[PDB]
Amino acid sequence: SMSYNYVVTAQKPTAVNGCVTGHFTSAEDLNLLIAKNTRLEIYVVTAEGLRPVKEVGMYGKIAVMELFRPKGESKDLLFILTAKYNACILEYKQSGESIDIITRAHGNVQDRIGRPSETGIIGIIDPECRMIGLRLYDGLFKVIPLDRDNKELKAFNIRLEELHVIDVKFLYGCQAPTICFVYQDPQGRHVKTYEVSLREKEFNKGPWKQENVEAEASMVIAVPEPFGGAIIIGQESITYHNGDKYLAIAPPIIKQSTIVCHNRVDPNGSRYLLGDMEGRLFMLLLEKEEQMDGTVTLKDLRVELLGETSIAECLTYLDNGVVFVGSRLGDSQLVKLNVDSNGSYVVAMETFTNLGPIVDMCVVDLERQGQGQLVTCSGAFKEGSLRIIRNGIGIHEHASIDLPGIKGLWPLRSDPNRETDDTLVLSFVGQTRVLMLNGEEVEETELMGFVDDQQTFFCGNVAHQQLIQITSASVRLVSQEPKALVSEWKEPQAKNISVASCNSSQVVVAVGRALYYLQIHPQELRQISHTEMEHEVACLDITPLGGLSPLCAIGLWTDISARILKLPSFELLHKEMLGGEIIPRSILMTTFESSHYLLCALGDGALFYFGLNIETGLLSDRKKVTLGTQPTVLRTFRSTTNVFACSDRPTVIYSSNHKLVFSNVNLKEVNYMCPLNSDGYPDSLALANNSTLTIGTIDEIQKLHIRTVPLYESPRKICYQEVSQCFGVLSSRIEVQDTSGGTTALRPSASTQALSSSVSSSKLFSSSTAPHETSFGEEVEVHNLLIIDQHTFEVLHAHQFLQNEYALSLVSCKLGKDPNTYFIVGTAMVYPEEAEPKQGRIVVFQYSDGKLQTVAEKEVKGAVYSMVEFNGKLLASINSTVRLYEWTTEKELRTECNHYNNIMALYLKTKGDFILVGDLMRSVLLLAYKPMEGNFEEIARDFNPNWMSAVEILDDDNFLGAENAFNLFVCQKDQHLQEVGLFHLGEFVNVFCHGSLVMQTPTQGSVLFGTVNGMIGLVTSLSESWYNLLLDMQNRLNKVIKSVGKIEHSFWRSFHTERKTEPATGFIDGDLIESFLDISRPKMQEVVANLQEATADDLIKVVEELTRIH
């Protein structure tokens, strides 16, 4: 058998890899364009911030993004080069309300042979738009002439003698196209210029040449006219060159960190923004000087500290003091630059969530309610954090009132001429209170004709401009403009009312087993019918689905039956046996997407929903879901109309492509609810708990919600320990040598602000050891194990490891017959500029009474790269060894097995008795534990080389891997492991983890993965028939979907490395499949044309079902 896999995006990439500004959408609009790997986001810069106008996806990793304006254009055009060398020129096209990104030119500029450069792909555009320059490989400069006839973006190569280019730019103010670049040779680093000639397709002698530049010169800045020239930024100095003009400064403020990005503030280059690796923001000023003749020359350079921002990957100045900080290691932000310091000139105004990099993550179900949550280790350095990702629907609360003991909510229009609710009637234990809504103000009032002494079961507006109130004693009908009691119905023998239901013109009241059908008439509650059911009535509903309902839904006590009766004869039309011994609590007739349903919920949290036929009253397609454990009450509201389910976990029911979806509301315990459409709270809801009354609006659809827990240091690994109700997190913080012969922290962080703290007292590497002294300004890493509460996410404890000890692996498990659960950490002694670590530790911690107690330690001769619990034993990877440890009764680790091989097992996963091993460069390996013989054995090995990054076991015979060239692959047994699946994902996978973020199908299994760019994906398995259908749909979709840049989807998903390239196999692009629901219905039929007896509605249900896995 083969392997068929389905990979889909759960969370799009959030890290910013690039940002440019200009007039792309129109000549009058200032735009900000953000590259997030495969996504391009287009914003309009206003005083309110950033207004989104368009977002597109590209079939490629965006490596180059530049705005430029050639002659004959009304706005700027966009040049993009992908990492697979797809080049295109794009234009923003708006036709009224339709937005199209059209391809003005496209082509692939990859060479047949060539070695990619160390500084990566560089793409520059000449200021006169004469040409596009590309540095793709060493020794070659690729030139794309910007001619009107170059529709295919044909290019030619010029031989570059300098084989190691650091950075290159096109110079301003030149009669001929001139490049300026920093290069590296055995003699150091230098800057050189060349004149590019399209006529001769060669280089000409540049205007100048500087033989020597700083050894760490890494960035070139082309200064615009009138000054021109170039600015070279290094680790220590900033220099300006322009023929015979030379300026050089060396400010000590920039020595502490490397400057990694820059941006121009003004079109003449008089001020520049600079950001370093610590998030500091600098201003580079080019000081002018007026001479005696009247000319103005460049006097000096000067930098000035502005303050602190997020660690910036790119910076973009916008309008008046507003700067966008594009970050890949933390959240992006909009910062404000003030001309007067506060000593910081920067002020953060908005933050934008970034999950990247996700270095580790785990799935937990804290409340044990059936839906898991993702807890990731995100960010790095001062941006490091934990993120909690949860599927659900958000609530925006706009009012809160402390009103305990509420037992019922009903909206009401006290005025018959208004179309807006102005009254909220509340029910309590034998009481009924009334509140009025005067705009945004709420005040308790009274309603004439209503009763405050009896608990209300229902009230609202009814026909003939009247009001109704159903209490536990009777049903009262009240006039409107002069409010007064006009009619009242009681039980013939004045017994209490058990169940109540009502619409605009009908009332159905139950008294035990007796039903009474009343009709609302002008000043008259006319009784039409009255019968007796065979069992006691539990719940009622008479919602007119097709305002005179001919049907009446009812739930019974002893039978546990949902019946549809006919008004007024009350005869039975359809009865469904629900089963069990729990009675139904709520029943509701509703309509979803023009289809009619019957909802019925019991007291145990079960929810049955059937298809309802209004003409016959026939129930069909019986299904069941679990919406909690407490009794559930159903109520409709207007978003179409949706159903709110009130229980211990609130759930909103809605529809999507004729399939019901049950989404959890991000709230705790909602006992009663009603819709509320007031002038101060339009299209809102009123929610009541055990203590407060809440008014707010609700989101339309389910999405991923993200909570952020800032750590201000780098998290590394995370594991959940249920028995302690806490997370264990390995973290690292940077410290710099001060002057007291030690290291000092640069800022407070999680490891230095915990409630309690401990330090390692191990003496394993103390005596008979030489010191590793450091120098001034040298940075060191201090590693810690954090204990994080699972509810408040506060740092309960922080244990600091030994100096120069790096925590690499973390696991939470029991071992042997020991009933305690431990945090186990694998470490390594890491010293500067050394090979593989020679010493390490395995430390067993126990969290008890808010403190971490060290239980045992085990010295190891190497780095403990990974650890996993293996059937009551500890499996550890140490350097080039896989070792199995036993937990003795004396609380010590004893070696049982030692598998000495040549692999470097950086990644370990286990299942049953097998182990999947991920090597640094030798792909994956399969080991199996022999129980009777007590050691390991190599079953099979993938023999083609793959620089692994993550590994996962899909099942007993399918093994999933990810490598450093952004590819996925699946290995299978035949011994040799055979690669039966290949797929270019376009992201760097850091962690695989089993689990799901939806409630608990055409697919099997669920594996989540987190990436460097913050993207979260999902992998699942398909059957052969489903894989063949979806593969056929891929080729049909690819013929219809227009691709930005005219990039072939199949070329994009093709497995690609430096030594190997072939199409994808065994993988379905779920993102492409899901886009089938985004095309028009006429365009839908073309896709499914002549598909095998397949209709568009057949695969709408197929694709909609596939969307439910995430």
Side-chain angles (χ1 to χ4, degrees), residues 255-472:
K255 218 262 199 303
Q256 330 165 18
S257 200
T258 314
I259 292 163
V260 283
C261 57
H262 64 256
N263 194 242
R264 218 162 57 226
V265 181
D266 68 83
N268 289 265
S270 86
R271 293 195 310 179
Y272 283 88
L273 294 167
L274 312 175
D276 61 12
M277 300 175 117
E278 315 191 290
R280 258 142 53 205
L281 188 63
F282 296 88
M283 186 103 99
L284 170 65
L285 303 100
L286 270 64
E287 274 134 5
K288 303 199 280 243
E289 182 188 53
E290 204 194 330
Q291 307 297 316
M292 301 55 243
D293 46 35
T295 65
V296 166
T297 51
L298 183 82
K299 212 210 159 324
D300 204 11
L301 307 167
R302 167 177 65 128
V303 317
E304 145 181 344
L305 182 52
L306 271 35
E308 209 178 77
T309 66
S310 284
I311 295 180
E313 170 75 13
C314 74
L315 292 159
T316 294
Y317 184 65
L318 310 170
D319 250 358
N320 325 64
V322 172
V323 179
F324 174 75
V325 184
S327 181
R328 57 166 253 267
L329 297 178
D331 288 349
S332 289
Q333 36 177 213
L334 277 182
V335 299
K336 171 77 216 277
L337 263 46
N338 294 305
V339 314
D340 300 345
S341 66
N342 66 345
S344 163
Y345 304 78
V346 314
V347 166
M349 338 164 63
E350 206 177 339
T351 78
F352 307 101
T353 285
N354 170 35
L355 305 180
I358 297 166
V359 314
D360 194 20
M361 73 197 198
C362 64
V363 170
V364 293
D365 194 356
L366 319 98
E367 253 161 298
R368 256 193 209 171
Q369 39 150 30
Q371 205 185 282
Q373 317 193 358
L374 204 39
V375 185
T376 75
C377 293
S378 293
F381 310 117
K382 71 188 198 56
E383 329 284 4
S385 74
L386 307 179
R387 309 283 171 143
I388 302 123
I389 297 109
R390 171 79 208 199
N391 238 335
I393 286 184
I395 174 82
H396 308 278
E397 294 178 32
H398 299 112
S400 172
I401 311 202
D402 178 272
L403 254 176
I406 281 173
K407 296 310 208 93
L409 274 64
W410 297 273
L412 193 41
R413 307 191 314 278
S414 78
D415 165 359
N417 329 101
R418 44 178 326 151
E419 58 147 48
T420 278
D421 304 323
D422 54 358
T423 309
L424 191 63
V425 186
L426 280 55
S427 151
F428 309 68
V429 202
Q431 249 75 72
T432 292
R433 298 169 74 160
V434 178
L435 316 158
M436 73 180 158
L437 301 201
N438 331 290
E440 299 254 348
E441 172 52 322
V442 170
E443 160 66 317
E444 174 154 21
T445 179
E446 331 158 326
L447 220 69
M448 195 87 23
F450 276 44
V451 153
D452 52 62
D453 200 12
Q454 291 308 10
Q455 171 166 345
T456 288
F457 283 0
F458 177 84
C459 76
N461 301 88
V462 286
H464 313 290
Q465 301 82 37
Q466 304 181 104
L467 310 185
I468 202 147
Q469 187 199 12
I470 296 190
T471 77
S472 97

Side-chain angles (χ1 to χ4, degrees), residues 26 162 164 217 248 275 333 363 396 407 417 425 445 452 485 499 574 655 692 825 832 963 1034 1107:
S26 100
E162 294 75 39
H164 195 185
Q333 36 177 213
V363 170
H396 308 278
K407 296 310 208 93
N417 329 101
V425 186
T445 179
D452 52 62
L485 208 181
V499 185
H574 187 110
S655 173
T692 87
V825 175
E963 52 93 55
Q1034 281 199 170
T1107 64

Side-chain angles (χ1 to χ4, degrees), residues 926-944:
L926 191 66
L927 297 164
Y929 179 73
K930 331 198 289 208
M932 308 333 165
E933 304 60 5
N935 84 333
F936 286 130
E937 142 194 35
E938 191 171 315
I939 299 304
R941 155 192 314 223
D942 197 22
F943 268 91
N944 33 41

Side-chain angles (χ1 to χ4, degrees), residues 9 53 91 172 234 238 366 375 398 655 740 780 795 921 937 975:
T9 297
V53 290
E91 173 182 0
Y172 285 91
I238 305 186
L366 319 98
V375 185
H398 299 112
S655 173
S740 94
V780 303
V795 192
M921 53 203 314
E937 142 194 35
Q975 282 296 14

